[PDB]
Amino acid sequence: GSSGSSGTSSNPVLELELAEEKLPMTLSRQEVIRRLRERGEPIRLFGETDYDAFQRLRKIEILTPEVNKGSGPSSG
């Protein structure tokens, strides 16, 4: 059970929505707002932060990546 052990932290510019939420904040507030927006989600809840909002969406992208019924798996 391995993948990589070094670190990069930079634009992935590879793949679009999937079962890969690893790595740190990949989608910035805006990057999270964009989707959330098109999703009709609140860009900012009643006591949320970049992370909360980020994670929230970061999870939404998993559940509903692009109109595709189905329940995401329990972690990769």
Swiss-Prot record:
Coiled coil: none annotated. Disulfide bonds: none annotated. It is found in: Nucleus speckle. It comes from the Eukaryota. Heterodimer with PPIH. Interacts with PRPF4 and with the spliceosome. Part of a complex containing U4/U6 snRNPs. Participates in the second step of pre-mRNA splicing. Belongs to the PRP18 family. This is Pre-mRNA-splicing factor 18. The chain holds residues 60 to 122 of 342 of the full protein.
